[PDB]
Structure formats: C-alpha cells, structure tokens
Amino acid sequence: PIETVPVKLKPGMDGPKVKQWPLTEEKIKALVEICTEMEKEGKISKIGPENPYNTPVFAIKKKDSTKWRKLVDFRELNKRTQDFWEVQLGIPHPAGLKKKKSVTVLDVGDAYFSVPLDEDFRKYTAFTIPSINNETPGIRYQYNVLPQGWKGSPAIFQSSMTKILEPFKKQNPDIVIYQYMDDLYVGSDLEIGQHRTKIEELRQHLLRWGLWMGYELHPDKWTVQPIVLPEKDSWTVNDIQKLVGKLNWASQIYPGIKVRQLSKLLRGTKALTEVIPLTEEAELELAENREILKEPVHGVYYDPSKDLIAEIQKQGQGQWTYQIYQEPFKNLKTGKYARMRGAHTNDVKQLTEAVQKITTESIVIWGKTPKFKLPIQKETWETWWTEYWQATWIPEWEFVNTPPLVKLWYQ
Amino acid sequence: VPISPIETVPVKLKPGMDGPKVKQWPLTEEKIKALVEICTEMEKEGKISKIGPENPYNTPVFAIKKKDSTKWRKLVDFRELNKRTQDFWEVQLGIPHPAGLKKKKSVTVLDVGDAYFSVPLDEDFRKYTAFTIPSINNETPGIRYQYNVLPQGWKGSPAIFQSSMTKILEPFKKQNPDIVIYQYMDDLYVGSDLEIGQHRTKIEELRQHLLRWGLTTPDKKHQKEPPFLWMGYELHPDKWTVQPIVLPEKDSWTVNDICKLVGKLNWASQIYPGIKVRQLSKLLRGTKALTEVIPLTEEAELELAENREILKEPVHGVYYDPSKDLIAEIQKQGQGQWTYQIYQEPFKNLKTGKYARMRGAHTNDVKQLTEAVQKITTESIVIWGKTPKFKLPIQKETWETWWTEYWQATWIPEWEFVNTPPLVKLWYQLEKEPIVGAETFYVDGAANRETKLGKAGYVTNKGRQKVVPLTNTTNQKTELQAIYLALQDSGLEVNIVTNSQYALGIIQAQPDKSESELVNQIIEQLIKKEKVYLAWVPAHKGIGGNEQVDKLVSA
DNA sequence: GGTCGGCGCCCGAACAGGGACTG
DNA sequence: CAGTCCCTGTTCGGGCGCCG
Structure with a gap:
C-alpha cells in the first residue's frame, strides 16, 4: 500500500541489453533457490521475451559467510539512470568517516524489498538465469520491489532510512553513518569493545523496523x-642509470x-x-x-565533479601498488598491498582482493567508486574474477598492458 | 475464431513505425498451387483468416521444398516487418551438448508436429501479418489472409515458442522433479531413473499434458528404443x-x-x-x-x-559422470595450433576440440597455452558447470618462472604436468642484474619521416662501434635493428642499453614468434646467448654512450 | 531456395588509443 | 604547442558448419 516513486532513465537512452555469462553449478542452484523464494514473496515475477532488456546475474559469498547472496550487475542500468540519484535525491558524504578509529559495514539490502518499485520501471530490471549445458531456455524474471545493487534504491529509501536512524543518531551524536549502495558504514572513535556493542545496538534497532x-x-x-x-x-x-x-x-x-x-x-x-x-x-x-x-x-x-581513476601495478612477491587520481600525475592517494589472499599462487585472486580494498577506501574517503585500469588481459579477467568477488558493489574497469618501465612505485 | 488454449504473448511495434506495405513477388505456377492448397487448409483450421480492404498492410510470400518429403513449407519474407517490430530477448542461450548428459535408466525422444502452428499470436498484432497470395491469373485480385499463429520466418516466433513451451512444461516439471527434460524448441529429451514401467506412464502423462494445450506428440516421431x-x-x-x-x-x-x-x-x-x-x-x-x-x-x-x-x-x-573428476589434456600440435580432450576415464573422451587463434603480433607458447586453458574453462562451465583438472605439457617450474615475473596478472587453475613432447618452455631468460665482465652496448636508431631513411648502430665500452644505413624504415624498426646489431656482434654474454620503450616492451614479453621477420631474427639471436641484460635510459639526457650513438644515427 | 533465431570458426576492414616527432 | 603516423589491439560485418 506504499506509493511508488516515479523514476525515468536519462534522456535519449534505452535500457541495458547485456547478455548473461555462463555460471557454475553451485551458483545456478543458489540462484534458483533464491529466485524461487523471492517469487513466492512477490519480490520478483517471471516475464517473457517481449521484454528486450536484460542484466547479468551471479551469486557470491561474503568474507567468512556460508550463505549465498544474489548479485546483479546493474552497472549499465546505473549508468543510464545517473541523473536521478545525484541531482534530486543525493546523499551527503561525511568527511569525518575516514578519520574514525573503527568503521563497520552492514548489508542492509533486505530492507529495499519492503518498498515497491515503479511499475513503468520494472521492465529495465530484467535478468535471466542460465541452465547447465543449456538444458532449458533462460528463466527470466523482473523486480517488483527496490532491487539490490541499483543506485536508485538507496536514494528512494533515504527518507525512510533517515527516520529509522534518527533515534539512534540522537542517542549517539558522535557516531558517523554513511549509506552507499546496499551497505551502511558506521564509524566511531570508541574503543573496539564498546564499538562492537553500539553496532549490535544498531543491529537490533534495525531489526525492529523489519x-x-x-x-x-x-x-x-x-x-x-x-x-x-x-x-x-x-x-x-x-x-x-x-x-x-x-x-x-x-x-x-x-x-x-x-x-x-x-x-x-x-x-x-x-x-x-x-x-x-x-x-x-x-x-x-x-x-x-x-x-x-x-x-x-x-x-x-x-574534485567532486571529476571521475576517480585507479591504476594497479603487479610488483611481484605478493606486492601490489596503486594510485588514485582524477587528473594525470595529480595522485590523490598512493598505496601498496602485500600478502593478500592467494599470495604466491593466484594473481587473479590478489588482483580481485586489491580492487575490493581500493574501492572500499574510495567509498570511505570520497563516496565514489573509481574506474580501474587493470594489469590483466580481458579474457583472463572475465574468466576468473567472479570466483573471488566478495562485495555487493561492482566498480567499472578497463584493461591495460603497460610493460614495466623503471620501477617508480616499488623499490 | 475460437480461443487457443495457450496464453498469447503481447507484441508491439517499435514506437513511431507502421506496418509493412510491400508488393508480392511473381511466383511460379507450381508454388502457387502449393500455397493455395496450404492456405485453404490453414483457413479451415483457424490458423489464417480472410481480410478485406480495411487492412492496408501486405508482405511477400513464397514456399520452399521440405527435405525428403512432397509437402511444402510456407515462409513469409518478413524482412520489413522484422525491422519495425519490437526487439525481443532470445531465451536460447546456447546449444545443449551430449557430453553434459547423465546416464539415465530410460530415455524417450519426441517431436511435436507443426510447432508454430500450435501456438497463437497476439490478437492486437495479427493485423500487421497481412499477405497476398497471387492467383494463377495475374488479373485476379488475389486472396489476402492474416496469421492467427506464429508465422514461420518471423523473428519473434522462435523466442515466443521457447518461452510458451517452457511455461507449459513447468507444471509437469514441478510435479515430476526427478524427471529430466531437455527442451530445445519442439525436441524433448525425457530421461529418468524410474523403473521402465513407471517411465512409460510418465511419458503418456506428459503426452496428455502437452495435448491439453494443443501440442500433438505423434507416434511417428516417438522414440522408445536406443x-x-x-x-x-x-x-x-x-x-x-x-x-x-x-x-x-x-x-x-x-x-x-x-x-x-x-x-x-x-x-x-x-x-x-x-x-x-x-x-x-x-x-x-x-x-x-x-x-x-x-x-x-x-x-x-x-x-x-x-x-x-x-x-x-x-x-x-x-x-x-558427476561422481568422478573432470580432466582436460592439451597438446601443442602445430605452430599456433592446439588440441584438447576432456575425459574422466583414460581414453574415454567426453569431447575434444582445438584452439588456434593468433592474438597479437608477438606471442609465445606460454601465452597461447593460457588462452587455450581459458577457452576450455569457459566451454566446460557451459556444459558441466565446473572447471576440469588440467594436464598441461609445461613444466611446473617453467610456468612458475613465467607468471611470477610477468607484469600482467595471469593464472591457471589446478593442473599437473604431463610429459608429452613437444613441451612448452621459455626459450630465453633476460637477466635481472647486469652481467659482470660482459661488453656493454649502447644502441639507438632513428629515421626521417619523409625520406624513410635512417641509421642504426651501437657504441661499446671496449671501443667497438658500428653504424648501418637503412632504407624504407621507421623510427620503431631502426631501434629494433640497433638491438639486432648488438646481439649479432657480441659474445655469449652482453649488456644492452637502449632508449626505446617500444623495443624493450616487445622483448621483455619473452616472445618466441612474431609477424615481423626482424623480431623473429632478434628472437633467434636471443636464444643463442647465455646471458642477456637489457636496460632502458631516457633519451636526450646526455646518458653514457646513448647520447654518443644518438648523434651518430641522428640523420 | 536466397525466411527467422541460436551457438561456433575464420578473415578483413573498420575503429581507437597510445606513444614519438615536428610546425 | 596540436597535428601527424607508426604500431597494436579490439570490434564488427559476412561466409560456412550445426540445430530447431
């Protein structure tokens, strides 16, 4: 019985039309069970080939998590609805979130299912579930509520979110809360003990609202x-020399x-x-x-109006350097990662972990996700990167092949 | 006109575009009889209906012979309608493969007769499917019909049928979960581990479940025996x-x-x-x-x-067999050619294949092997949903040396070494530190953008020198030529100092093949050496002999 | 015959981006 | 300085195979 917020694409732009990539068996079974349950709860409904739109879908497991999580690649949809969540219902970015001693992330994606989506916009949330060996044709669905991973969902739910957080923000005024995509960043200078306690206070404060x-x-x-x-x-x-x-x-x-x-x-x-x-x-x-x-x-x-760009260099021996900039040679931040998961054995895993850590740092400092220049072939990356993804957001990337010049970033 | 039992699929035209209005081709008299005979029969069955002058649309029509039969098939040249019809999302993501089938106790194959002619078309869309059938006389006005079902030759018919077919099979699949039904258009592969008695019962249950919606399963196309x-x-x-x-x-x-x-x-x-x-x-x-x-x-x-x-x-x-591991083995066959076999038990191949795409002007066997591994990995996840274990004709130390030193991220899944010659190996290793007691060559090359002329040479620490005039060349070719000269006139150990990012980037990628004959000659000289150390210095900075040799090859 | 869709391969031509050099 | 061009990689258009 909730009124729908009318949403439109950017002028002169059609919906996304991206083909679905092959999925492993463990991911297909995970999507079939979740989509069957979400259809039973009215969150999604089956559609047909009259809908010319589609968006890739795959499943993940967060760090130290057993349950599968449904993940949709709405990047193309988010690129074709950009003016909505930046001009009309934008979210401010707290400059003090990066200065906190501890910051914790919470997956609040389940709350978006409580708000219905605009009927005219459900056509663009279409996706397809493939079958192993193409046993059956594609099983298509479309979203009936606010989807997870769409940049319009946290903007519409923002007004509802602020009223849920007001009783907690008033009790704890020194705590900083930022909302990006399906995540909630809660930062405080409290000691690690009472910090995790205030989180559980907020976890129960959010459970009572559904x-x-x-x-x-x-x-x-x-x-x-x-x-x-x-x-x-x-x-x-x-x-x-x-x-x-x-x-x-x-x-x-x-x-x-x-x-x-x-x-x-x-x-x-x-x-x-x-x-x-x-x-x-x-x-x-x-x-x-x-x-x-x-x-x-x-x-x-x-510059808030300029896009963030990130370059990564493979320095060997489990060493990876990176730089974040908007204009060339004007690096906003440099850094180096070492001994990540898959060190000394899997680079794609190290490169995937490096993109995640860099993107997370960009969200905390500027509230934006950078576009990546990845030191990997396109076919090598598109084959293995999903096997090591553990985040609910997906940054944009491109592939470069710059041979090492003269080791500028690592001794 | 009666109502079809199957739910229809709503179809629109693209916004701001009208139906087709195109004239009919002249038809041979033998095809006209085949069309009028089929058109009058389909009109009696409610699949096409007469239309009057109120329908301003028209599209050509013809007929081709059916394979190994006297019957004719009716096709419509909907090329103009397909342009202005809405875009569909095809649900056929690929083609099934027998290598992904699991051993079932009983198997049954059936094909429905005239598939499209059993699925209805959207009522509001029937008006745009208007066509004329020319008579035996050119003066006769001709009979105009409009489709009531899916027209063969229309771009929406395959996508509509595959979705309408899956919707009808879902109630049966929901009640019979242990039954495996491979659905490709009208082809239904039905297998199960139920006893052969209860299998034929479920077959007839499905043949009646399909018959309730107007889908006929003829016993001529029925298959019960292997x-x-x-x-x-x-x-x-x-x-x-x-x-x-x-x-x-x-x-x-x-x-x-x-x-x-x-x-x-x-x-x-x-x-x-x-x-x-x-x-x-x-x-x-x-x-x-x-x-x-x-x-x-x-x-x-x-x-x-x-x-x-x-x-x-x-x-x-x-x-x-899902109980046993998946195995894939590759063999270097020809230059730029690779073959592979996917199996679970030795010599019992699930399927074979080949990879031969040449990517880039410069490459090596290790790059091509990695590309083949990825092509097999994607192909396997399509058919079996998992990545096989690899048996690769490359040493474990050979691959360890490559991926650890390469500047790109590269990785191969769980694999083991198989000693099947020819073995993939790196043909030369660039030293990481300068060689002590080795002659140091400072190479450079230049060319004039117009004359297409240039020089290429080197200067060493032992006084050695050479400059060579070159005709019909470029700045890039000369800088590669200078390194080729240093490799020719040096011993088994040599230190080379260049300022060419272009030349240094190609060589550091340790290529063993190239479309350029000059690079192939540079490769051949690098294999003959024991220790090679390349280095890069910025040009026009007065560095070592790199400025002395830049002035010699200036023109 | 010269209808549609799907996947695969092969090739050339188009596009497109990054260096180095020059008015 | 921007305008080239030399090089290299990617995308696409058009043929065949196959199935429905």
Whole structure:
C-alpha cells in the first residue's frame, strides 16, 4: 500500500541489453533457490521475451559467510539512470568517516524489498538465469520491489532510512553513518569493545523496523606509498642509470626534480658494472631530490565533479601498488598491498582482493567508486574474477598492458 | 475464431513505425498451387483468416521444398516487418551438448508436429501479418489472409515458442522433479531413473499434458528404443557419436567449397581428435570472390588427406559422470595450433576440440597455452558447470618462472604436468642484474619521416662501434635493428642499453614468434646467448654512450 | 531456395588509443 | 604547442558448419 516513486532513465537512452555469462553449478542452484523464494514473496515475477532488456546475474559469498547472496550487475542500468540519484535525491558524504578509529559495514539490502518499485520501471530490471549445458531456455524474471545493487534504491529509501536512524543518531551524536549502495558504514572513535556493542545496538534497532553483517575497517591506520630512492653507499653505472630514469619519470609529478648533475656522471661509454663515485654536485642533487619526494605535490585536491581513476601495478612477491587520481600525475592517494589472499599462487585472486580494498577506501574517503585500469588481459579477467568477488558493489574497469618501465612505485 | 488454449504473448511495434506495405513477388505456377492448397487448409483450421480492404498492410510470400518429403513449407519474407517490430530477448542461450548428459535408466525422444502452428499470436498484432497470395491469373485480385499463429520466418516466433513451451512444461516439471527434460524448441529429451514401467506412464502423462494445450506428440516421431537420434547425434546406453559427416571431394575447389569444408571440419573436431584446419584456412586469407577457384597448396593437400584418414575410423564419446573428476589434456600440435580432450576415464573422451587463434603480433607458447586453458574453462562451465583438472605439457617450474615475473596478472587453475613432447618452455631468460665482465652496448636508431631513411648502430665500452644505413624504415624498426646489431656482434654474454620503450616492451614479453621477420631474427639471436641484460635510459639526457650513438644515427 | 533465431570458426576492414616527432 | 603516423589491439560485418 506504499506509493511508488516515479523514476525515468536519462534522456535519449534505452535500457541495458547485456547478455548473461555462463555460471557454475553451485551458483545456478543458489540462484534458483533464491529466485524461487523471492517469487513466492512477490519480490520478483517471471516475464517473457517481449521484454528486450536484460542484466547479468551471479551469486557470491561474503568474507567468512556460508550463505549465498544474489548479485546483479546493474552497472549499465546505473549508468543510464545517473541523473536521478545525484541531482534530486543525493546523499551527503561525511568527511569525518575516514578519520574514525573503527568503521563497520552492514548489508542492509533486505530492507529495499519492503518498498515497491515503479511499475513503468520494472521492465529495465530484467535478468535471466542460465541452465547447465543449456538444458532449458533462460528463466527470466523482473523486480517488483527496490532491487539490490541499483543506485536508485538507496536514494528512494533515504527518507525512510533517515527516520529509522534518527533515534539512534540522537542517542549517539558522535557516531558517523554513511549509506552507499546496499551497505551502511558506521564509524566511531570508541574503543573496539564498546564499538562492537553500539553496532549490535544498531543491529537490533534495525531489526525492529523489519530488516545483519560485520566487516571492520580502521581508516586511521591507512598509509600511502611514497616514491623512495635507494640509499646505496657504492653506486655503479647501472645504478645511476636506473636512478636517472626513475628521477626523470618522477619529474612529471614533482617539477623540481633535477638530473643534470647525475647525468654528468654518465658522460663516458662505461661498463654497467663499473663503480662510479658521486661528485659533490651530484650528492647534493640526490639529497635535494629526496627532500622534494618528502614534500606533497603542489595543487592536488579532490574534485567532486571529476571521475576517480585507479591504476594497479603487479610488483611481484605478493606486492601490489596503486594510485588514485582524477587528473594525470595529480595522485590523490598512493598505496601498496602485500600478502593478500592467494599470495604466491593466484594473481587473479590478489588482483580481485586489491580492487575490493581500493574501492572500499574510495567509498570511505570520497563516496565514489573509481574506474580501474587493470594489469590483466580481458579474457583472463572475465574468466576468473567472479570466483573471488566478495562485495555487493561492482566498480567499472578497463584493461591495460603497460610493460614495466623503471620501477617508480616499488623499490 | 475460437480461443487457443495457450496464453498469447503481447507484441508491439517499435514506437513511431507502421506496418509493412510491400508488393508480392511473381511466383511460379507450381508454388502457387502449393500455397493455395496450404492456405485453404490453414483457413479451415483457424490458423489464417480472410481480410478485406480495411487492412492496408501486405508482405511477400513464397514456399520452399521440405527435405525428403512432397509437402511444402510456407515462409513469409518478413524482412520489413522484422525491422519495425519490437526487439525481443532470445531465451536460447546456447546449444545443449551430449557430453553434459547423465546416464539415465530410460530415455524417450519426441517431436511435436507443426510447432508454430500450435501456438497463437497476439490478437492486437495479427493485423500487421497481412499477405497476398497471387492467383494463377495475374488479373485476379488475389486472396489476402492474416496469421492467427506464429508465422514461420518471423523473428519473434522462435523466442515466443521457447518461452510458451517452457511455461507449459513447468507444471509437469514441478510435479515430476526427478524427471529430466531437455527442451530445445519442439525436441524433448525425457530421461529418468524410474523403473521402465513407471517411465512409460510418465511419458503418456506428459503426452496428455502437452495435448491439453494443443501440442500433438505423434507416434511417428516417438522414440522408445536406443539408439536415439537427438540434436544430430546417436545416443546409446553407454556411448554417443555424431551422425555421419560427409566432406566434398571437389576436383576444383572454389572459396565457398573451402568454407563448407572448414565448417564441417570444425564441427567434426568435437569428437574427432586431431583435426587441423590451419593450412586450409590459409587459403581463405586475402581472397575476394566466393566463387573464385583456388588451387590447393602442398601443405593444404596433406592436411586434407590427414583429416580424411581420421574421419575413416569410428569415434564415440561418453556421458558425464558427476561422481568422478573432470580432466582436460592439451597438446601443442602445430605452430599456433592446439588440441584438447576432456575425459574422466583414460581414453574415454567426453569431447575434444582445438584452439588456434593468433592474438597479437608477438606471442609465445606460454601465452597461447593460457588462452587455450581459458577457452576450455569457459566451454566446460557451459556444459558441466565446473572447471576440469588440467594436464598441461609445461613444466611446473617453467610456468612458475613465467607468471611470477610477468607484469600482467595471469593464472591457471589446478593442473599437473604431463610429459608429452613437444613441451612448452621459455626459450630465453633476460637477466635481472647486469652481467659482470660482459661488453656493454649502447644502441639507438632513428629515421626521417619523409625520406624513410635512417641509421642504426651501437657504441661499446671496449671501443667497438658500428653504424648501418637503412632504407624504407621507421623510427620503431631502426631501434629494433640497433638491438639486432648488438646481439649479432657480441659474445655469449652482453649488456644492452637502449632508449626505446617500444623495443624493450616487445622483448621483455619473452616472445618466441612474431609477424615481423626482424623480431623473429632478434628472437633467434636471443636464444643463442647465455646471458642477456637489457636496460632502458631516457633519451636526450646526455646518458653514457646513448647520447654518443644518438648523434651518430641522428640523420 | 536466397525466411527467422541460436551457438561456433575464420578473415578483413573498420575503429581507437597510445606513444614519438615536428610546425 | 596540436597535428601527424607508426604500431597494436579490439570490434564488427559476412561466409560456412550445426540445430530447431
């Protein structure tokens, strides 16, 4: 008996038409049971081929979770409904969420099923469930309520969400709560003990309204990866060559970098393994360049109207570096991950875990998901990435093949 | 007109576009009799109805012969209607494969007679399916009908039938969950582990459940005894095989004949292991006319004779056993060619196949092997919903060296080494640190964008030097040429310093094959060496001999 | 014959993005 | 400086195979 919020696509744009990719047996059985139950609860209803729209669907398991979770790739739908959840019903982003000692994420996707969807918009939420060996044609459904993973769901439910959170926000005014997609980020400076207690207070405060998760973050312990120069006591020709190339590349970021005196040491046609003593003018150019790398870049600041972009480099031995920027060489944040799940054996798993950690950090700091430049072939990524996904959101990505130049981000 | 028992599918035209208004083709007198005989019969059965001048739409119509029968089939050239009709989402996501079938006690195959003619069309959409039937006299006005069912030749008919058919089978499948029904259009593969007595009962229960909605299951198309003919195969209680394949034996081959040959060889490669189409597909490159005669090359005739000899012996596949693991084994066959076999017990193949796509101007066997693994993995998840265990002709240390040092993310699922030559291996390893006591070469190359002329040479720490004039070249080709010279004139251990990102990116990818003959020569020189160390320095920075050799090759 | 849809292969041509060099 | 071009990869259009 709830009124529907009318939603429209962006002008001059049709709905998504993305084919469904093959799914494993364990995922198909998980989707069949969930879709059968959701159809019984009226959340979805079967449709036919007259609906020309479709969206890929697959299943996941969150970290340390046994139950399967239905996940839909609405990226294309979210790209074709962008003006709704940014202009009309936008959500503010708390700048203090990233400064908290502890931040916990909660899957509040089940609450969206309590609100019906606009009847004219149900046509675009269409998806298909494949069968093993194509035993049967595709079993199609469409959503009758607010779908999980749609960027219009948290905007419509925002007014209902604020009234649920007002009794808890008034009791605990120093706690910061942010809502992105199907997740709720609750941050506080409380001690770890009473922090988890206040979460369970909110878990029960949400259960009484008709709604459970627990992933802990510590943004105050997030570190950046700076560009560092080696501290050798004896330098060879090859060392100084690599040093100049790295300092030459870093000059695009720090305009004050100079390699004039160091290049003078490479005047002759010397053997690479030959030891070269550093001149007095070169030792000062080396020390001044180290100090410049300590300084922050001049004129770097976040633009809310610009898209976030993230690049990742495979540094070997379980090492992965990354940089987040909106304009080239104006990196908002750098970093490095080490010894993730699948280290020393599976890169796709490490690359998937790295995208998740980076995206999570972007949500906490700016409230946006970056577009990724992934160091992997397209077919290699599209084959294995779903097998290691553990998040309810999906960032956008593209594939690059930049051979290693001169190790700028890792020693 | 009576109401059909099946629920109709609402269909619209695209917004702002009207029905078709196109004139009828001139028809031969033999096809006109076949159409009028079929049109008058379908009008009596309520499948087409007469229309008057109030219907302003029209579309052509013709008829083709049915295979191995005197009956004719009525087809409508709905090319203009298909353009303005709404887009449908096809529910047929793929084609089933016998390798995914599980051993069932009893099997039954049936095909419904005239499938489309049993499913109704949307009432509001019947008006746009208007066509004229020309008479034996050109002056006779002609009989205009409109469809009441799914017209054969319409783009919406297959998508509508497959969805309408699944809706009718759901009540039976819901009551009979342990029954397996492979549904492809009108083809129903019904298998179960029930005893053969209760199996025939459930078969007749379904033949009446389908009859309630106007779907006839003729006993002519009924199949109770093995072997069953299902989707172009022969299903036996323990094994399956494709229905026989026939290749043309042309004395003079055109381009279309090779395409028909290549297509059947690709279809045969599913169970016929070792089929190669490399030398035959080389006949299709850079050719324009479909009817152009092409002579067979010596390498192409040998490949065809080998494929004919494989098709002589009988091959058969087995069925999937979910209790045992899935295994896939690959073999390097030819350069750029790979074959594989998927099985659970040795020599009992579920299916075979081949991978031969050449990706990139530069590649190696390790890249091609990884591409083949992914192609098999996707193919397996389609048919069995799982990833098989791999037996790969590559050393465990060989692969460990590759993926750990490569800058791209790359990974292969659970696999084990099989010692089947030829083995995939890296042909050279670039040193990580500069070689002590090795001559150090500073190479560079340049070219003029207009004259297409340039130089390429090197300078070493031992005073050695060389510069070579080059004609009809580019900046990229010269920088590769400079490295080729350094590799030619050096010993077994050599340090090379370049400023070419282009050249350094190609070599560090450890390629063993290339479309460029220059890269192939650089590869051949890298294999002969024992230790090679490449390095990159920025150009125009006054670095080492890289500035001395940049000035020599400047022009 | 020159109807529709699905999947697969092969090739060329179109598109498209990133470097290096030049007015 | 933007305008090229040299290179390389990707997407697509059009043929065959096969099934319904």
